[PDB]
């Protein structure tokens, strides 16, 4: 039994200098990321109650934690992500399949949510494109199981992944942490020349996937000269999202009514053109 | 040399009872189709001068003629399309490479642009999912060259293609037309139970590609229960777009300035939520 | 009265995981940068006494503080740079001319040493080639007075300057610091998204010059695809170095004997080939 | 179409009292001359086979024949030079640009390679700085086409060129040799007070340039008090090298693989400090 109309949540995050109708945002490339693989998208708002998130959680089929620059500890974003993370562990544990994806900031958050500790250190990775240095465990992985061979070889040898993060979790800090070592299979690592860090990982026992890099940029962001845009960079963004949405199709939650489904969808919101200056071509702002 | 920043135009279409800011439209699924294979999009307005279309044509890297309900002979859409068609035939003849894509109404328009005649017949195909019946000629073909072998087997045997057309050209009328027979390679056909019609074609000597069916619907349109949304239907939409945007990467046109590029991009426009009532989840309306 | 045998010191910086004979290092591109403009170079070791540094200061004609990855307050590099900075202000205040150059990390240190504060902000500039957005003040600047007008034009319009840092001082923060504002003339800025940052400056009242970017990379480092290597990128590195060595030729210091001079020169050291792996083709490692 | 990663060979020459690891040498000033104009350098070993020289020749983008004191007729140097000269004449004649630079001894070698005869006579120029006495033919020359007007004036009137040769070809012996007069355009002459000799030349029909004097010495050698080290002497070394490296960028040769490229580079070798004693501050010795 499969859900061919998956709806996935994307978490909004705190705007730095917030105003009314401008309290949180979502970069449109994360919306496009998921839509292209045949999902619809609901924005998850920031300063809501446990019950409101619980109602939405039970309605949607997966959730993505996007990149950005807010606090992993004290932000509306971190708090809402922690609520989704416990709900997802509950559901999966009970036997309902519910996938979670973390990108950049979202990857960092997951290391903090699962280990209890802030384990991040500085890496020179603020706007650089890298290949993936796959680990010994990529072989039987879930994430990359459905990628073409030629694409796997291009990922290993071509600079296909966009990194814009001032922090990483070194492989040394990761491996020294008992909780993370047991919880997550590391699929790729990378180096800035000085420190080797985790770049792609998936939970052993849960459908939880995370990248330190930004798969959604290659097809959808054109603002910066280090964003990969070769043909295999484009297929990378499709195959990454294809895997995740195929995860969401294993989840059978639905909204109570088509009416409530219709009001929650991203189609209710119009993004602003931010690409003349911002790293993001388009950005959704929310009250 | 290839162009790793392709920009493709999508033709806007006359609104049936037009009002200011609502004289023409583009369904957002055509925009999402192109962006997802790593292209940016420019809307091509309907009531412009020959010189303005020339200037736009010389700035962008390909064009798409979308489906819809407008006149093939007397609409602003049909006029603009004829101008782009003629500019494309000139550029390619001279040795530039400029690709043209027609979908559904746009496929029908191309049969008329090339043959000079309307040769369409009624088919009982106004809302149905169909496989494709490939011709022997699919083996040499340009369009399907990079499709995975399993995806080609799935298109042959599974209902992955969205048909929503009341008209078609039967294979018999296509064949009896000397101009069409000489200009286009037929790649797939289909039947409505009574009439066998051309569903996919490409020009022998030009990068002009057309489908009677709607490849953009599978991943981006959720308004009708017949629209295919299986995992291989999602891959069909990506491989179709990936081929076309790879053709556009062979074209080296650029805008005269980045400020002029920035003003033309679809990012400057905000679509309306039309999915509760119309065939399209979102629609861009233009003055 | 000029010194046509200038010798310039280049400060070594702390090796992260130091070992005997590998306590500090200098990228060879900084040596080559100064030699090509007709200077000899002395490496300035870290973790030496005040008196040793004062002896060396009194013998050489100028000093460069090179880019790199070390801490701004606790490194042997930062403490030696503070010493040379204080010696240079004393000598210039007294009436002796002694020029100081800071590149990247060096530029950072200069803002700290003069302001007494840490004013850096994050920018996605870990690997990007940028033009310079000159200020009105480049006009009668000392640094650029002798550059060819065409080179100045190329510099304003082509990506000729290598950036590989991730912390910059924004123009707002520079202007808001009274001590920096009164001390340094900003010659060029660049923009990372919304953040406009100081990229080249020179002290109003002292021969102290600093670039956020790496002039020495264009001619000498071949390890990353974005490093500028066009003909005008090559002339930029020569003219930048030529200006600074022409500053050192105004200083009349010499070593107490030709034997002491000979033992201090970089010719006593052999670099390692570090290019297959690191950002530098060659590096000098020191005990 | 240009090569922005040019690599140029520098010929090593026979050590006089040869020993293992000391059979040939290159003075580091030739390597520095070229790197400063944005080339990488490969040392060309002396006792190699014709096939080995062919393989290298086809991988590199130009070659320089340095000065020195080895036989023009029986050395490993003069043999390797003959092979490169013949390969370069072949390549240029076929339509493949390949530039050759001779300095001092290398200039004398070229007069022998092209005329078939030794036409040199003693001049009193073993260690003196001279201006260049330009011919009428400098005006449309290739070598000096991009030099600043003011530098060409300084070269005419200031002692900017290092002469350290006891042999020269007089302008009278030059002119009387039919082969030389038809193959080379004389750009400058000089006199020792009794003999007027050729000091700079370029081939009319090939990219072959030669100086009797040593452009590389002004910026990089500090062993003799005659060596010119004024600002404009420093610019002379940069502009000479700049010309020749720009010639090498017209050559599209590459190595078969990056690994083979990496093993051939001068970065693999370390020079010795020879400055206390010899004409050269630093020298590369080879087995
Ligand atoms: C929306 N519509 C009804 C329709 C048509 N013309 C109108 N014209 C006006 N002035 N006002 C209207 N309300 C109006 N409505 C349509 C839609 C498609 C086709 C049509 O023939 N489409 C092609 C292409 C199919 C496709 O592209 O979707 C076909 O073969 O069916 C005709 C009318
Ligand atoms: C160092 N030296 C002495 C010298 C020459 N040949 C030798 N050959 C052998 N086998 N062994 C020696 N010890 C030896 N020594 C030299 C140096 C330059 C010239 C010479 O004629 N050079 C050219 C080129 C000038 C230059 O390139 O510097 C000239 O015109 O003077 C001759 C002898």
TrEMBL record, chains A, B, C, D:
Compartments reported by the entry: Secreted, Extracellular space
Predominant location: secreted
GO biological-process terms attached to the record: folic acid-containing compound metabolic process; tetrahydrofolylpolyglutamate metabolic process
Any single Gene Ontology cellular-component annotation: vacuole
GO molecular function: gamma-glutamyl-peptidase activity
Enzyme Commission (EC) number: 3.4.19.9
Record keywords: Hydrolase, Secreted, Signal
Active site: 104, 214
Domain of life from the UniProt record: Eukaryota
InterPro entries: Class_I_gatase-like (IPR029062), Pept_C26_g-glut_hydrolase (IPR015527), Peptidase_C26 (IPR011697)
CDD domains (UniProt xref): GATase1_Glutamyl_Hydrolase (cd01747)
Family to which this protein belongs: Belongs to the peptidase C26 family.
Name of the protein: folate gamma-glutamyl hydrolase
Origin species: Danio rerio
């Amino acid at each position: 039994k499969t859900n061919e109309r998956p709806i996935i949540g994307v978490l909004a995050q705190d705007v730095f200098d917030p105003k009314p109708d401008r309290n949180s945002y979502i970069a449109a490339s994360y919306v496009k990321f998921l839509e292209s693989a045949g999902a619809r998208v609901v924005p998850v708002m920031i300063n809501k109650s446990e019950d409101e998130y619980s109602r939405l959680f039970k309605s949607i089929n997966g959730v993505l934690f996007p990149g950005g620059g807010v606090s992993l500890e004290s932000s509306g974003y971190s708090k809402a992500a922690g609520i989704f993370y416990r709900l997802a562990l509950e559901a999966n544990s009970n036997g309902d399949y519910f996938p979670v994806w973390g990108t950049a900031l979202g990857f960092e958050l997951l290391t903090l949510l699962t280990s209890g500790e802030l384990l991040l250190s500085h890496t020179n990775t603020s706007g650089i494109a890298l290949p993936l240095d796959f680990t010994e465990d990529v072989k039987g992985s879930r994430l990359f199981k459905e990628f073409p061979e030629e694409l796997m070889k291009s990922l290993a040898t071509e600079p296909l992944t966009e990194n814009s993060h001032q922090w990483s979790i070194t492989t040394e800090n990761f491996t020294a942490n008992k909780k993370l070592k047991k919880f997550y299979r590391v699929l790729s690592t990378n180096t800035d020349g000085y420190n080797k860090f985790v770049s792609t990982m998936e939970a052993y026992d849960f459908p939880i996937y995370a990248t330190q890099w930004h798969p959604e940029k290659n097809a959808f962001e054109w603002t910066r000269p280090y964003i990969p845009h070769t043909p295999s960079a484009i297929k990378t963004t499709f195959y990454m999202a294809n895997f995740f949405v195929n995860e969401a199709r294993k989840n059978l939650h639905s909204f109570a009514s088509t009416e409530e489904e219709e009001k929650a969808l991203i189609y209710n919101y119009k993004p602003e053109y931010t690409g003349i200056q911002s790293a993001f071509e388009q950005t959704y702002f929310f009250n």
